Amino acid sequence: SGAIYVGNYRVVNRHLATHNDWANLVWEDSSRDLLVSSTTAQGCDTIARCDCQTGVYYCSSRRKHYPVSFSKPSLIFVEASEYYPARYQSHLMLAVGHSEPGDCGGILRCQHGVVGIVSTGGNGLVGFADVRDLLWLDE
Ligand SMILES: COc1ccccc1[C@H](NC(C)=O)C(=O)N1CCC[C@H](C(N)=O)C1
Ligand SMILES: [Zn+2]
């Protein structure tokens, strides 16, 4: 679990959005596993606007942060789960690092701010949904 809170927005994994997230929907994209909802309070996070390929992510299944080198956002095949059919997920960045079911929502940050959130994983891999192209989160 986990979310990004920026301005009057909350960014979560679409497959983990709550009834309240859907009732206050701003934007969602099943192909990216993202959903943004509106909030009444001002957020705590700021968003990176960069091309960094290294950073640090939070891994809830280890209660620890780990450094990672990650690929550029791209279209990557993701096998079927209880939440989605087998499909291509877009704006996804892969890295080598621990992740297991439950780790979605952990934030990935570089020196410039929030880069994205954990969205996929498996066998020593971790995939992050990028948010750096969502320029409207800042306005
Ligand atoms: C962090 O996720 C994992 C990590 C290691 C192993 C497995 C997983 C997850 N598999 C299960 C069965 O929970 C996983 O990758 N996803 C499930 C939730 C939706 C995700 C998506 N973006 O399509 C895909
Ligand atoms: Zn950066």
Curated annotation (Swiss-Prot):
It catalyses: Selective cleavage of Tyr-|-Gly bond in the picornavirus polyprotein. The active site is at residues 15, 33, 104. Transmembrane segments: none annotated. Zn(2+) 1 binds at residues 50, 52, 110, 112. Cysteine protease that cleaves viral polyprotein and specific host proteins. It is responsible for the autocatalytic cleavage between the P1 and P2 regions, which is the first cleavage occurring in the polyprotein. Also cleaves the host translation initiation factor EIF4G1, in order to shut down the capped cellular mRNA translation. Inhibits the host nucleus-cytoplasm protein and RNA trafficking by cleaving host members of the nuclear pores. Counteracts stress granule formation probably by antagonizing its assembly or promoting its dissassembly. Homodimer. This is Protease 2A. The lineage of its organism: Viruses, Riboviria, Orthornavirae, Pisuviricota, Pisoniviricetes.
